[PDB]
């Protein structure tokens, strides 16, 4: 992905978790985090509790949403996604997509990964494979300082 592109096909259908929401309902008011995750990956299990405290710290200041990547037999099934999500206290909207609409635009082939957007929905930064989201917390504060 190039930076400064608008958020494209923010949709899913296989399942969705806590809620689902479109670009035009997220942007207009606050910057955004989209993150891609899998219940099969060790670094996603470290990102997950950090996503819970990040959501709490930043929900008033930045939107959060997630996209599950079906990648392996242990994350292939949305009941497993639901049950694992409930334990991680992730309460942002999440979707799972069998059509992989974002993989047509982003060309997703990475997890965990994180994409941070300004309040008009232009991509400001992208990172992947962090120690959970500990670095990403800084870039989000940097994007707040670009959007306030």
For the chain, the domains span 1-148
Class of domain 1-148: alpha beta
Q: The tokens 């957007």 sit on which residue? A: 117
**Residues β-bridged to residue 95:** 16, 67
DSSP class of residue 76 equals S
Per DSSP bridges, beta strands 113-117 and 32-37 are antiparallel
Instruction: Please name every residue paired with 34 in a beta bridge, in sequence order, or none if there are none.
Output: 65, 115
How far does CA 66 lie from the centroid of its chain? 3
Give the largest CA-CA distance in the chain. 43
Check: CB of residue 15 under 8 Å from CB of residue 96: yes
For 100, left (φ over 0), alpha (ψ -120 to 50), or beta?
left
Q: How far apart are CA 8 and CA 140, in angstroms?
A: 20
Contacts of 50-54 with CB under 8 Å at 24 or more apart are 50/132, 50/133, 50/134, 50/137, 51/88, 51/90, 51/92, 51/133, 52/88, 52/89, 52/90, 52/91, 54/133, 54/136, 54/137, 54/140
Tokens of 107: 């060309």
């Amino acid at each position: 992905m190039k930076l400064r592109q608008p958020m494209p096909e923010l949709t899913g259908e296989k399942a969705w978790l806590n809620g689902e929401v479109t670009r035009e309902q997220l942007i207009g008011e606050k910057p955004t985090l989209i993150h891609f995750w899998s219940i099969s990956c060790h670094l996603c299990k470290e990102a997950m509790p950090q996503v819970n405290e990040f959501r709490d710290k930043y929900q008033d200041q930045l939107n959060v949403v997630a996209v599950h990547m079906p990648r392996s037999e242990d994350d292939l099934d949305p009941g497993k996604i639901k049950e694992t999500a409930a334990e991680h206290d992730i309460t942002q909207p999440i979707f799972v997509d069998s059509d992989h609409a974002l993989t047509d635009a982003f060309e997703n082939e990475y997890v965990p990964a994180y994409y941070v957007f300004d309040k008009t929905g232009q991509l400001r930064h992208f990172q992947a494979g962090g120690s959970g989201m500990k670095m990403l917390e800084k870039r989000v504060n940097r994007v707040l300082a670009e959007t306030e």
